[PDB]
Amino acid sequence: MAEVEETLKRLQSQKGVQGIIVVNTEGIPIKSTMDNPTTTQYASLMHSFILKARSTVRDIDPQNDLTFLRIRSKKNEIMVAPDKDYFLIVIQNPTE
Amino acid sequence: MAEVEETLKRLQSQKGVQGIIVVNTEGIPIKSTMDNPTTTQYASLMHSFILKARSTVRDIDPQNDLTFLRIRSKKNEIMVAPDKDYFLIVIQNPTE
């Protein structure tokens, strides 16, 4: 549990940092490196989308499940790994 | 256009083949290596989901867009690249 939170900080990567938002089972981000308005505009928008994967994923068969996800984007990389009782959107990049 | 269709065949990869489904702007798969019932059960289910990315993606800002996507799954890899007037779900795997 505590080690898992430490992993989130490792998501900082190095500097690409497009914005980091940690969200719990509540939907509301328990933490974020964003100013504030970006945090909810993305958190609320991404939160709804992330549940679609687990929902859509389970709809076909319980045999499989969502272990990780990453949407490509011209402006930045989109990736949100849903863990145990917490999940987060990691907006960052390789300065590419 | 014709070269793009040839690329789809290259998606065969080597043998992982979990199922390959080509879908056009119609929603209905213009082609597939699946028996038949799997093709529509996944195509119709995946079709709705794929549009959510472009929809969700554009909802935040037109500056970015979905160039490619890949959902992780315990049973197989999920990936569907939406191209110009056609897009397809490539279900395959590295026999891992």
Side-chain angles (χ1 to χ4, degrees), chain A:
Chain A
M1 189 87 262
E3 295 183 350
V4 167
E5 301 294 344
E6 184 70 23
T7 304
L8 246 59
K9 187 174 72 111
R10 189 73 182 169
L11 308 193
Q12 195 69 228
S13 207
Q14 65 88 13
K15 190 176 72 235
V17 179
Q18 298 298 328
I20 300 176
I21 302 174
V22 187
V23 190
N24 54 345
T25 64
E26 293 300 342
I28 295 167
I30 265 185
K31 191 70 181 278
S32 71
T33 63
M34 280 184 168
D35 292 346
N36 243 101
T38 308
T39 306
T40 306
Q41 288 186 245
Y42 274 46
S44 306
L45 188 142
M46 290 251 64
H47 178 247
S48 305
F49 176 99
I50 295 171
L51 300 183
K52 297 183 185 198
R54 183 184 185 182
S55 192
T56 291
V57 165
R58 185 183 188 146
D59 187 6
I60 298 181
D61 248 329
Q63 297 177 353
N64 71 91
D65 60 10
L66 183 78
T67 278
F68 225 108
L69 180 66
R70 54 245 281 148
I71 305 172
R72 191 75 152 127
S73 128
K74 186 80 186 286
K75 178 73 178 100
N76 59 16
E77 187 184 1
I78 300 176
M79 186 189 72
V80 55
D83 214 8
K84 297 185 186 123
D85 59 339
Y86 295 111
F87 57 90
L88 64 156
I89 304 167
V90 180
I91 317 105
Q92 63 187 34
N93 227 30
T95 78
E96 186 184 1

Coordinates of all heavy atoms in Angstrom, one line a residue, chain A:
Chain A
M1 N 0.9 -1.2 0.0 CA 0.0 0.0 0.0 C 0.9 1.3 0.0 O 0.8 2.1 -0.9 CB -0.8 -0.1 1.3 CG -1.9 1.0 1.3 SD -3.4 0.4 0.4 CE -3.0 1.1 -1.2
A2 N 1.7 1.4 1.0 CA 2.6 2.6 1.1 C 3.6 2.6 -0.1 O 3.9 3.6 -0.7 CB 3.3 2.6 2.4
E3 N 4.1 1.4 -0.4 CA 5.1 1.3 -1.5 C 4.4 1.6 -2.8 O 5.0 2.2 -3.7 CB 5.5 -0.2 -1.5 CG 6.3 -0.5 -0.2 CD 6.8 -1.9 -0.2 OE1 6.4 -2.7 -1.1 OE2 7.6 -2.3 0.7
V4 N 3.1 1.3 -2.9 CA 2.4 1.6 -4.2 C 2.3 3.1 -4.4 O 2.5 3.6 -5.5 CB 1.0 1.0 -3.9 CG1 0.0 1.5 -5.0 CG2 1.0 -0.5 -4.0
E5 N 2.1 3.8 -3.3 CA 2.1 5.3 -3.5 C 3.4 5.8 -3.9 O 3.5 6.8 -4.7 CB 1.7 5.8 -2.1 CG 0.3 5.3 -1.7 CD -0.8 5.8 -2.6 OE1 -0.5 6.7 -3.3 OE2 -1.9 5.2 -2.6
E6 N 4.4 5.2 -3.4 CA 5.8 5.6 -3.8 C 6.0 5.4 -5.3 O 6.6 6.2 -6.0 CB 6.8 4.7 -3.0 CG 8.2 5.1 -3.2 CD 8.5 6.5 -2.5 OE1 7.7 6.8 -1.6 OE2 9.4 7.2 -2.9
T7 N 5.4 4.4 -5.8 CA 5.5 4.1 -7.2 C 5.0 5.3 -8.0 O 5.5 5.7 -9.0 CB 4.7 2.8 -7.4 OG1 5.2 1.8 -6.6 CG2 4.8 2.4 -8.9
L8 N 3.8 5.8 -7.6 CA 3.2 7.0 -8.3 C 4.3 8.1 -8.5 O 4.4 8.6 -9.6 CB 2.1 7.4 -7.4 CG 0.7 7.2 -8.0 CD1 0.5 5.7 -8.3 CD2 -0.4 7.7 -7.1
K9 N 5.0 8.4 -7.5 CA 6.1 9.4 -7.6 C 7.1 9.0 -8.6 O 7.6 9.8 -9.4 CB 6.7 9.6 -6.2 CG 7.7 10.7 -6.2 CD 8.2 11.0 -4.8 CE 9.1 9.8 -4.4 NZ 10.5 10.5 -4.3
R10 N 7.4 7.7 -8.7 CA 8.3 7.3 -9.8 C 7.8 7.5 -11.1 O 8.5 7.6 -12.1 CB 8.5 5.8 -9.5 CG 9.7 5.2 -10.4 CD 11.0 5.7 -9.8 NE 12.0 5.2 -10.8 CZ 13.3 5.7 -10.7 NH1 13.6 6.7 -11.3 NH2 14.1 5.0 -10.0
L11 N 6.5 7.7 -11.2 CA 5.8 8.0 -12.5 C 6.3 9.4 -13.1 O 6.2 9.6 -14.2 CB 4.3 8.0 -12.3 CG 3.9 6.7 -11.6 CD1 2.4 6.5 -11.6 CD2 4.6 5.5 -12.2
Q12 N 6.8 10.2 -12.2 CA 7.3 11.5 -12.6 C 8.2 11.4 -13.8 O 8.3 12.2 -14.7 CB 8.1 12.0 -11.4 CG 8.4 13.5 -11.5 CD 7.1 14.3 -11.4 OE1 6.8 15.1 -12.1 NE2 6.3 14.0 -10.4
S13 N 8.9 10.2 -13.9 CA 9.8 9.9 -15.1 C 11.0 10.8 -15.1 O 12.1 10.3 -14.9 CB 8.9 10.2 -16.3 OG 9.4 9.4 -17.4
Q14 N 11.0 12.0 -15.5 CA 12.2 12.9 -15.5 C 11.9 14.3 -15.7 O 12.6 15.2 -15.2 CB 13.0 12.3 -16.7 CG 12.2 12.5 -18.0 CD 12.6 13.9 -18.6 OE1 13.6 14.5 -18.1 NE2 11.9 14.4 -19.6
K15 N 10.9 14.6 -16.5 CA 10.5 16.1 -16.8 C 9.4 16.2 -17.8 O 8.8 17.2 -17.9 CB 11.8 16.7 -17.4 CG 11.6 18.3 -17.5 CD 12.9 18.9 -18.0 CE 13.1 18.6 -19.4 NZ 14.4 18.0 -19.5
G16 N 9.2 15.2 -18.6 CA 8.1 15.2 -19.6 C 6.8 15.8 -19.0 O 6.2 16.7 -19.6
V17 N 6.5 15.4 -17.8 CA 5.4 15.9 -17.0 C 4.3 16.7 -17.8 O 4.4 17.9 -17.9 CB 6.0 16.8 -16.0 CG1 5.0 17.4 -15.1 CG2 7.0 15.9 -15.2
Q18 N 3.3 16.0 -18.3 CA 2.2 16.8 -18.9 C 1.1 17.1 -17.8 O 0.3 17.9 -18.0 CB 1.7 15.8 -20.0 CG 2.8 15.5 -21.0 CD 3.2 16.8 -21.7 OE1 2.4 17.7 -21.9 NE2 4.4 16.9 -22.1
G19 N 1.2 16.3 -16.7 CA 0.3 16.5 -15.6 C 0.1 15.2 -15.0 O -0.1 14.2 -15.6
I20 N 0.1 15.1 -13.7 CA -0.1 13.7 -13.0 C -1.3 13.8 -12.1 O -1.4 14.6 -11.2 CB 1.2 13.4 -12.2 CG1 2.4 13.4 -13.2 CG2 1.1 12.1 -11.6 CD1 3.7 13.3 -12.4
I21 N -2.2 12.9 -12.3 CA -3.4 12.9 -11.4 C -3.7 11.5 -10.8 O -4.1 10.6 -11.5 CB -4.6 13.3 -12.4 CG1 -4.3 14.6 -13.0 CG2 -5.9 13.4 -11.6 CD1 -5.3 15.0 -14.1
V22 N -3.7 11.5 -9.5 CA -4.0 10.2 -8.8 C -5.5 10.2 -8.4 O -6.0 11.1 -7.8 CB -3.2 10.3 -7.5 CG1 -3.3 9.0 -6.7 CG2 -1.7 10.5 -7.8
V23 N -6.2 9.1 -8.8 CA -7.7 9.1 -8.4 C -8.0 7.8 -7.7 O -7.7 6.7 -8.1 CB -8.5 9.3 -9.7 CG1 -9.9 9.5 -9.4 CG2 -8.0 10.4 -10.5
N24 N -8.8 8.0 -6.7 CA -9.2 6.8 -5.9 C -10.6 6.2 -6.3 O -11.1 6.7 -7.3 CB -9.3 7.2 -4.4 CG -10.2 8.5 -4.3 OD1 -10.5 9.1 -5.3 ND2 -10.6 8.9 -3.1
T25 N -11.1 5.3 -5.6 CA -12.4 4.7 -6.0 C -13.5 5.8 -6.0 O -14.6 5.5 -6.4 CB -12.7 3.7 -4.9 OG1 -12.8 4.3 -3.7 CG2 -11.5 2.6 -4.9
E26 N -13.2 6.9 -5.4 CA -14.2 8.0 -5.3 C -14.5 8.7 -6.6 O -15.5 9.2 -6.9 CB -13.5 9.0 -4.4 CG -13.3 8.5 -3.0 CD -14.7 8.1 -2.4 OE1 -15.7 8.7 -2.9 OE2 -14.7 7.4 -1.4
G27 N -13.5 8.7 -7.5 CA -13.6 9.4 -8.8 C -12.8 10.6 -8.7 O -12.1 11.1 -9.6
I28 N -13.0 11.3 -7.6 CA -12.2 12.5 -7.3 C -10.7 12.2 -7.0 O -10.4 11.3 -6.3 CB -12.9 13.1 -6.0 CG1 -14.3 13.5 -6.3 CG2 -12.1 14.3 -5.6 CD1 -15.0 13.7 -5.0
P29 N -9.9 13.0 -7.7 CA -8.4 12.8 -7.5 C -7.9 13.0 -6.1 O -8.1 14.0 -5.5 CB -7.8 13.8 -8.5 CG -8.9 14.9 -8.6 CD -10.2 14.1 -8.6
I30 N -7.3 12.0 -5.5 CA -6.8 12.1 -4.2 C -5.5 13.0 -4.2 O -4.9 13.4 -3.2 CB -6.5 10.7 -3.7 CG1 -7.7 10.2 -2.9 CG2 -5.3 10.6 -2.8 CD1 -7.5 8.9 -2.3
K31 N -4.9 13.2 -5.4 CA -3.7 14.0 -5.5 C -3.4 14.4 -7.0 O -3.9 13.8 -7.9 CB -2.6 13.1 -4.9 CG -1.3 13.9 -4.7 CD -1.5 14.9 -3.6 CE -0.2 15.8 -3.4 NZ 0.7 14.9 -2.6
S32 N -2.6 15.4 -7.1 CA -2.3 15.8 -8.5 C -1.2 16.9 -8.5 O -1.1 17.8 -7.7 CB -3.6 16.4 -9.1 OG -3.9 17.6 -8.4
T33 N -0.3 16.9 -9.5 CA 0.7 17.9 -9.7 C 0.2 19.0 -10.6 O 1.0 19.9 -11.0 CB 1.9 17.2 -10.3 OG1 1.5 16.7 -11.6 CG2 2.3 16.0 -9.5
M34 N -1.1 19.0 -10.9 CA -1.6 20.1 -11.8 C -2.1 21.3 -11.0 O -2.2 21.2 -9.8 CB -2.8 19.4 -12.5 CG -2.4 18.6 -13.7 SD -3.9 17.9 -14.5 CE -3.0 17.3 -16.0
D35 N -2.2 22.4 -11.6 CA -2.7 23.6 -10.9 C -4.0 23.4 -10.2 O -4.1 23.5 -9.0 CB -2.8 24.7 -12.0 CG -1.5 25.1 -12.6 OD1 -0.5 24.7 -12.0 OD2 -1.5 25.7 -13.6
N36 N -5.0 23.0 -10.9 CA -6.3 22.7 -10.2 C -7.4 22.4 -11.2 O -8.0 21.4 -11.2 CB -6.7 23.9 -9.3 CG -6.7 23.5 -7.9 OD1 -5.7 23.7 -7.1 ND2 -7.7 22.9 -7.4
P37 N -7.7 23.4 -12.0 CA -8.8 23.3 -13.0 C -8.5 22.2 -14.0 O -9.3 21.4 -14.4 CB -8.9 24.6 -13.7 CG -7.5 25.2 -13.5 CD -7.0 24.7 -12.1
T38 N -7.2 22.0 -14.4 CA -6.9 20.9 -15.3 C -7.1 19.6 -14.6 O -7.5 18.6 -15.2 CB -5.4 21.1 -15.6 OG1 -5.1 22.5 -16.0 CG2 -4.9 20.2 -16.7
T39 N -6.8 19.5 -13.3 CA -7.0 18.3 -12.6 C -8.4 17.7 -12.7 O -8.6 16.6 -13.0 CB -6.7 18.6 -11.1 OG1 -5.4 19.3 -11.0 CG2 -6.7 17.4 -10.3
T40 N -9.4 18.5 -12.4 CA -10.8 18.0 -12.5 C -11.3 17.9 -13.9 O -12.0 16.9 -14.3 CB -11.6 19.1 -11.7 OG1 -11.1 19.2 -10.4 CG2 -13.1 18.6 -11.6
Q41 N -10.9 18.8 -14.8 CA -11.4 18.7 -16.2 C -10.9 17.4 -16.8 O -11.6 16.7 -17.5 CB -10.8 19.9 -16.9 CG -11.5 21.2 -16.5 CD -11.0 22.4 -17.4 OE1 -10.3 23.3 -16.9 NE2 -11.2 22.4 -18.7
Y42 N -9.7 17.0 -16.5 CA -9.2 15.7 -17.0 C -9.6 14.6 -16.1 O -10.1 13.5 -16.6 CB -7.7 15.8 -17.0 CG -7.2 16.5 -18.3 CD1 -7.9 17.7 -18.7 CD2 -6.1 16.0 -19.0 CE1 -7.4 18.3 -19.9 CE2 -5.7 16.6 -20.1 CZ -6.3 17.8 -20.6 OH -5.9 18.4 -21.8
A43 N -9.5 14.7 -14.8 CA -9.8 13.6 -13.9 C -11.3 13.2 -14.1 O -11.6 12.0 -14.3 CB -9.7 14.2 -12.5
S44 N -12.2 14.1 -14.1 CA -13.6 13.7 -14.3 C -13.8 13.2 -15.7 O -14.5 12.2 -15.9 CB -14.4 15.1 -14.2 OG -14.1 15.7 -12.9
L45 N -13.2 13.7 -16.7 CA -13.4 13.2 -18.1 C -12.7 11.8 -18.2 O -13.3 10.9 -18.7 CB -12.7 14.2 -19.0 CG -13.0 13.9 -20.4 CD1 -13.2 15.2 -21.2 CD2 -11.8 13.1 -21.0
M46 N -11.5 11.7 -17.7 CA -10.8 10.4 -17.7 C -11.4 9.4 -16.8 O -11.5 8.2 -17.2 CB -9.4 10.7 -17.3 CG -8.6 11.6 -18.3 SD -7.3 10.6 -19.1 CE -8.5 9.4 -19.9
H47 N -11.9 9.8 -15.7 CA -12.5 8.8 -14.7 C -13.6 8.1 -15.5 O -13.6 6.9 -15.6 CB -13.1 9.6 -13.6 CG -13.8 8.7 -12.6 ND1 -15.1 8.8 -12.4 CD2 -13.3 7.7 -11.8 CE1 -15.5 7.8 -11.5 NE2 -14.4 7.1 -11.1
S48 N -14.6 8.8 -16.0 CA -15.7 8.1 -16.8 C -15.1 7.2 -17.8 O -15.5 6.0 -17.9 CB -16.4 9.3 -17.4 OG -16.8 10.2 -16.4
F49 N -14.2 7.6 -18.6 CA -13.6 6.8 -19.7 C -12.9 5.5 -19.1 O -13.1 4.4 -19.6 CB -12.5 7.7 -20.3 CG -11.8 6.9 -21.4 CD1 -12.1 7.0 -22.7 CD2 -10.7 6.0 -21.0 CE1 -11.4 6.3 -23.7 CE2 -10.0 5.3 -22.0 CZ -10.4 5.4 -23.3
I50 N -12.1 5.6 -18.1 CA -11.4 4.4 -17.5 C -12.4 3.4 -17.1 O -12.2 2.2 -17.5 CB -10.6 5.0 -16.3 CG1 -9.6 5.9 -16.8 CG2 -10.0 3.8 -15.6 CD1 -9.0 6.6 -15.5
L51 N -13.5 3.7 -16.4 CA -14.5 2.7 -16.1 C -15.0 1.9 -17.3 O -15.4 0.8 -17.3 CB -15.6 3.4 -15.3 CG -15.0 4.1 -14.1 CD1 -16.1 4.8 -13.3 CD2 -14.3 3.1 -13.2
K52 N -15.0 2.6 -18.4 CA -15.6 2.0 -19.7 C -14.7 0.8 -20.0 O -15.2 -0.3 -20.3 CB -15.5 3.0 -20.8 CG -16.4 4.2 -20.4 CD -16.4 5.2 -21.5 CE -17.2 6.4 -21.1 NZ -17.5 7.2 -22.4
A53 N -13.4 0.9 -19.9 CA -12.5 -0.3 -20.2 C -12.9 -1.5 -19.3 O -13.3 -2.5 -19.7 CB -11.1 0.2 -19.8
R54 N -12.8 -1.3 -18.0 CA -13.2 -2.5 -17.1 C -14.6 -2.9 -17.4 O -14.9 -4.1 -17.5 CB -13.1 -1.9 -15.6 CG -13.4 -3.1 -14.7 CD -13.3 -2.5 -13.2 NE -13.5 -3.7 -12.4 CZ -13.6 -3.6 -11.1 NH1 -14.1 -2.5 -10.6 NH2 -13.2 -4.5 -10.3
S55 N -15.5 -2.0 -17.6 CA -16.9 -2.4 -17.9 C -16.9 -3.1 -19.3 O -17.3 -4.3 -19.4 CB -17.7 -1.0 -18.1 OG -19.1 -1.3 -18.1
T56 N -16.4 -2.5 -20.3 CA -16.3 -3.1 -21.6 C -15.5 -4.4 -21.6 O -15.9 -5.4 -22.1 CB -15.6 -2.1 -22.5 OG1 -16.4 -0.9 -22.7 CG2 -15.2 -2.7 -23.8
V57 N -14.4 -4.4 -20.9 CA -13.6 -5.6 -20.8 C -14.4 -6.7 -20.1 O -14.4 -7.8 -20.7 CB -12.5 -5.1 -19.8 CG1 -11.7 -6.3 -19.3 CG2 -11.5 -4.2 -20.6
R58 N -15.0 -6.5 -19.0 CA -15.8 -7.6 -18.3 C -17.0 -8.0 -19.2 O -17.5 -9.1 -19.1 CB -16.1 -7.0 -17.0 CG -16.9 -8.0 -16.1 CD -17.3 -7.4 -14.8 NE -17.8 -8.5 -14.0 CZ -17.6 -8.5 -12.7 NH1 -16.5 -8.9 -12.2 NH2 -18.6 -8.1 -11.9
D59 N -17.6 -7.1 -19.9 CA -18.8 -7.4 -20.7 C -18.5 -8.6 -21.6 O -19.4 -9.4 -21.7 CB -19.1 -6.1 -21.5 CG -20.4 -6.3 -22.2 OD1 -21.1 -7.3 -22.0 OD2 -20.7 -5.4 -23.0
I60 N -17.4 -8.7 -22.2 CA -17.1 -9.8 -23.1 C -16.9 -11.1 -22.3 O -17.6 -12.1 -22.6 CB -15.9 -9.5 -23.9 CG1 -16.2 -8.2 -24.8 CG2 -15.5 -10.6 -24.8 CD1 -14.9 -7.9 -25.6
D61 N -16.0 -11.1 -21.4 CA -15.7 -12.4 -20.6 C -15.0 -12.1 -19.3 O -14.1 -11.2 -19.3 CB -14.9 -13.2 -21.5 CG -15.7 -14.5 -22.0 OD1 -16.5 -14.9 -21.2 OD2 -15.5 -14.9 -23.1
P62 N -15.3 -12.7 -18.3 CA -14.7 -12.5 -17.0 C -13.3 -13.2 -17.0 O -12.4 -12.9 -16.1 CB -15.6 -13.3 -16.0 CG -16.3 -14.3 -16.8 CD -16.4 -13.7 -18.2
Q63 N -13.0 -14.0 -17.9 CA -11.7 -14.7 -18.0 C -10.6 -13.7 -18.1 O -9.5 -13.9 -17.6 CB -11.8 -15.6 -19.2 CG -12.9 -16.6 -19.0 CD -13.0 -17.5 -20.3 OE1 -12.4 -17.2 -21.3 NE2 -13.8 -18.5 -20.3
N64 N -10.8 -12.6 -18.8 CA -9.7 -11.6 -18.9 C -10.0 -10.3 -18.1 O -11.1 -10.2 -17.5 CB -9.7 -11.3 -20.4 CG -10.9 -10.5 -20.9 OD1 -10.9 -9.2 -20.8 ND2 -12.0 -11.1 -21.2
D65 N -9.2 -9.4 -18.1 CA -9.4 -8.1 -17.3 C -8.4 -7.0 -17.8 O -7.5 -7.3 -18.5 CB -9.1 -8.5 -15.9 CG -7.6 -9.0 -15.8 OD1 -6.9 -8.9 -16.7 OD2 -7.2 -9.6 -14.8
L66 N -8.6 -5.8 -17.4 CA -7.7 -4.7 -17.8 C -6.6 -4.6 -16.8 O -6.7 -4.2 -15.7 CB -8.6 -3.4 -17.8 CG -7.8 -2.3 -18.3 CD1 -7.7 -2.3 -19.8 CD2 -8.4 -1.0 -17.9
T67 N -5.4 -4.9 -17.3 CA -4.2 -4.8 -16.4 C -3.5 -3.5 -16.6 O -2.7 -3.0 -15.8 CB -3.3 -6.0 -16.9 OG1 -3.7 -7.2 -16.3 CG2 -1.8 -5.7 -16.6
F68 N -3.7 -2.8 -17.7 CA -3.0 -1.5 -18.0 C -3.5 -0.9 -19.3 O -4.0 -1.5 -20.2 CB -1.6 -1.9 -18.1 CG -0.7 -0.9 -17.3 CD1 -0.1 -1.3 -16.1 CD2 -0.6 0.4 -17.8 CE1 0.7 -0.4 -15.4 CE2 0.2 1.3 -17.0 CZ 0.8 0.9 -15.9
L69 N -3.4 0.4 -19.4 CA -3.9 1.1 -20.7 C -3.1 2.3 -21.1 O -2.5 3.0 -20.3 CB -5.4 1.4 -20.4 CG -6.0 2.1 -21.6 CD1 -6.1 1.1 -22.7 CD2 -7.4 2.6 -21.3
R70 N -3.1 2.6 -22.4 CA -2.4 3.8 -22.9 C -2.9 4.3 -24.2 O -2.7 3.7 -25.2 CB -0.9 3.3 -23.1 CG -0.9 2.0 -24.0 CD -0.5 0.8 -23.1 NE 1.0 0.9 -23.1 CZ 1.7 0.5 -22.1 NH1 1.6 -0.8 -21.7 NH2 2.5 1.3 -21.4
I71 N -3.6 5.4 -24.2 CA -4.1 6.0 -25.5 C -3.1 6.9 -26.1 O -2.4 7.7 -25.4 CB -5.4 6.8 -25.1 CG1 -6.3 5.8 -24.3 CG2 -6.1 7.3 -26.3 CD1 -7.5 6.7 -23.7
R72 N -2.8 6.8 -27.4 CA -1.8 7.7 -28.0 C -2.5 9.1 -28.3 O -3.7 9.2 -28.5 CB -1.6 7.0 -29.4 CG -0.3 7.7 -30.1 CD 0.9 7.2 -29.3 NE 2.0 7.3 -30.4 CZ 3.1 8.0 -30.2 NH1 4.1 7.4 -29.6 NH2 3.2 9.2 -30.5
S73 N -1.7 10.1 -28.3 CA -2.2 11.5 -28.5 C -1.2 12.4 -29.1 O 0.0 12.4 -28.8 CB -2.6 12.0 -27.1 OG -2.0 13.3 -26.9
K74 N -1.6 13.2 -30.1 CA -0.6 14.1 -30.8 C 0.0 15.1 -29.7 O 1.2 15.5 -29.9 CB -1.4 14.9 -31.8 CG -0.5 15.8 -32.6 CD 0.2 14.9 -33.7 CE 1.2 15.7 -34.5 NZ 0.4 16.7 -35.3
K75 N -0.7 15.5 -28.8 CA -0.2 16.5 -27.8 C 0.6 15.8 -26.6 O 1.4 16.5 -26.0 CB -1.5 17.2 -27.2 CG -1.1 18.2 -26.2 CD -0.5 19.4 -26.8 CE -0.2 20.4 -25.7 NZ 1.3 20.3 -25.5
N76 N 0.3 14.6 -26.4 CA 1.1 13.9 -25.3 C 0.7 12.5 -25.2 O -0.2 12.0 -25.9 CB 0.6 14.7 -24.0 CG -0.9 14.5 -23.9 OD1 -1.6 13.7 -24.5 ND2 -1.6 15.3 -23.0
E77 N 1.3 11.7 -24.3 CA 0.9 10.3 -24.2 C -0.2 10.2 -23.1 O -0.1 10.8 -22.1 CB 2.1 9.5 -23.7 CG 1.9 8.0 -23.7 CD 3.1 7.3 -23.1 OE1 4.1 7.9 -22.8 OE2 3.0 6.1 -23.1
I78 N -1.2 9.4 -23.4 CA -2.3 9.2 -22.4 C -2.2 7.8 -21.8 O -2.2 6.8 -22.5 CB -3.6 9.4 -23.1 CG1 -3.6 10.8 -23.8 CG2 -4.8 9.2 -22.2 CD1 -4.9 11.0 -24.6
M79 N -2.1 7.7 -20.5 CA -2.0 6.3 -19.9 C -2.5 6.3 -18.4 O -2.2 7.2 -17.7 CB -0.5 6.0 -19.9 CG -0.2 4.6 -19.4 SD 1.6 4.4 -19.2 CE 1.7 5.3 -17.7
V80 N -3.4 5.4 -18.1 CA -3.9 5.4 -16.7 C -4.0 3.9 -16.2 O -4.8 3.2 -16.6 CB -5.3 6.0 -16.8 CG1 -6.1 5.2 -17.8 CG2 -6.0 5.9 -15.4
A81 N -3.1 3.6 -15.3 CA -3.1 2.2 -14.8 C -4.0 2.0 -13.5 O -3.7 2.5 -12.5 CB -1.7 1.9 -14.4
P82 N -5.1 1.3 -13.7 CA -6.0 1.1 -12.6 C -5.5 0.0 -11.7 O -5.5 -1.2 -12.0 CB -7.3 0.7 -13.2 CG -7.0 0.1 -14.6 CD -5.6 0.7 -14.9
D83 N -5.1 0.4 -10.5 CA -4.5 -0.6 -9.5 C -5.6 -1.2 -8.6 O -6.8 -1.3 -8.9 CB -3.5 0.2 -8.7 CG -2.3 -0.7 -8.3 OD1 -2.3 -1.8 -8.8 OD2 -1.5 -0.2 -7.6
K84 N -5.2 -1.5 -7.3 CA -6.2 -2.0 -6.3 C -7.3 -1.0 -5.9 O -8.2 -0.8 -6.7 CB -5.4 -2.5 -5.1 CG -4.4 -3.6 -5.6 CD -3.7 -4.1 -4.3 CE -2.6 -5.1 -4.8 NZ -1.3 -4.5 -4.2
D85 N -7.1 -0.3 -4.8 CA -8.2 0.7 -4.4 C -7.8 2.1 -4.9 O -8.3 3.1 -4.4 CB -8.2 0.6 -2.9 CG -6.9 0.9 -2.3 OD1 -5.9 0.8 -3.0 OD2 -6.8 1.3 -1.1
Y86 N -7.0 2.2 -5.9 CA -6.6 3.5 -6.4 C -6.1 3.4 -7.9 O -5.6 2.3 -8.3 CB -5.4 4.0 -5.6 CG -5.9 4.2 -4.1 CD1 -5.4 3.4 -3.1 CD2 -6.7 5.3 -3.9 CE1 -5.8 3.6 -1.8 CE2 -7.1 5.5 -2.5 CZ -6.7 4.7 -1.5 OH -7.1 4.9 -0.2
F87 N -6.3 4.4 -8.6 CA -5.9 4.3 -10.1 C -5.5 5.7 -10.5 O -6.0 6.7 -10.0 CB -7.1 3.8 -10.8 CG -8.3 4.7 -10.6 CD1 -8.5 5.7 -11.4 CD2 -9.2 4.4 -9.5 CE1 -9.7 6.5 -11.2 CE2 -10.3 5.2 -9.3 CZ -10.5 6.3 -10.2
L88 N -4.6 5.9 -11.4 CA -4.2 7.2 -11.8 C -3.9 7.4 -13.3 O -3.4 6.5 -14.0 CB -2.9 7.5 -11.0 CG -1.8 6.5 -11.4 CD1 -0.5 7.2 -11.1 CD2 -2.0 5.2 -10.7
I89 N -4.1 8.6 -13.8 CA -3.8 9.0 -15.2 C -2.4 9.6 -15.2 O -2.1 10.5 -14.5 CB -4.8 10.1 -15.5 CG1 -6.2 9.6 -15.3 CG2 -4.7 10.5 -17.0 CD1 -7.2 10.8 -15.3
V90 N -1.5 9.0 -15.9 CA -0.1 9.5 -15.9 C 0.1 10.3 -17.2 O 0.5 9.8 -18.2 CB 0.8 8.3 -15.8 CG1 2.3 8.8 -15.9 CG2 0.6 7.6 -14.5
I91 N -0.1 11.6 -17.2 CA 0.2 12.4 -18.4 C 1.7 12.9 -18.3 O 2.1 13.6 -17.5 CB -0.8 13.6 -18.4 CG1 -2.2 13.1 -18.0 CG2 -0.9 14.2 -19.8 CD1 -2.5 13.5 -16.5
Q92 N 2.5 12.4 -19.2 CA 3.9 12.7 -19.2 C 4.5 12.5 -20.7 O 3.7 12.3 -21.6 CB 4.6 11.7 -18.3 CG 4.4 10.2 -18.8 CD 4.9 9.2 -17.8 OE1 4.7 9.4 -16.6 NE2 5.4 8.1 -18.2
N93 N 5.8 12.5 -20.9 CA 6.3 12.3 -22.3 C 7.8 12.3 -22.3 O 8.5 12.8 -21.4 CB 5.7 13.6 -23.1 CG 5.1 13.1 -24.4 OD1 4.6 12.0 -24.5 ND2 5.1 13.9 -25.4
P94 N 8.3 11.8 -23.4 CA 9.8 11.7 -23.6 C 10.3 12.9 -24.3 O 11.3 12.8 -25.0 CB 9.9 10.4 -24.5 CG 8.6 10.3 -25.2 CD 7.6 11.2 -24.5
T95 N 9.7 14.0 -24.2 CA 10.1 15.3 -24.9 C 10.3 15.0 -26.4 O 11.1 15.6 -27.0 CB 11.5 15.7 -24.2 OG1 12.5 14.8 -24.7 CG2 11.4 15.5 -22.7
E96 N 9.7 14.0 -26.9 CA 9.8 13.6 -28.3 C 9.0 14.6 -29.2 O 9.3 14.8 -30.3 CB 9.4 12.2 -28.4 CG 9.6 11.7 -29.9 CD 9.1 10.3 -30.0 OE1 8.5 9.7 -29.1 OE2 9.2 9.7 -31.1

